[PDB]
Design a protein around this ligand. Sequence first.
Ligand SMILES: [Mg+2]
Ligand SMILES: [Mg+2]
Lengths: 51, 51
Amino acid sequence: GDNTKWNENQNPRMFLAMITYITRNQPEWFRNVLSIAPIMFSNKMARLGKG
Amino acid sequence: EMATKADYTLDEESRARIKTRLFTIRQEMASRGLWDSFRQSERGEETIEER
Ligand SMILES: [Mg+2]
Ligand SMILES: [Mg+2]
C-alpha cells in the first residue's frame, strides 16, 4: 500500500494534538518548545518561486 | 570564616579586607531592604530551572 497526497493531507493541527497528548505530565517549557513547530506550520506561507 | 585545616592561605589584612567588603555589601543590601530573600535564596540556586 501507498498513501495518496500524504504531505498535503497531514494537518499541522493534528500534529499539535499528537504532541500535546504525547507530552502530558511533562514540564510546561518542554511542551511549549515542542508545540511551536506545529503552530508555525499551521500559519505557514509558501513562496511562489521565480514566476 | 572557615578553611581546610584552618590554613587560610592569605594573611590577616587581606582576609580583613575581604570581610570588610562583604560587610559593606550586606549593609548596603539591608539599606534597600533586599537581604532577607537573598539570604533565603541559597537552597535553590544550584538547580537550573528552564523557562
Ligand atoms: Mg508502498
Ligand atoms: Mg508513491
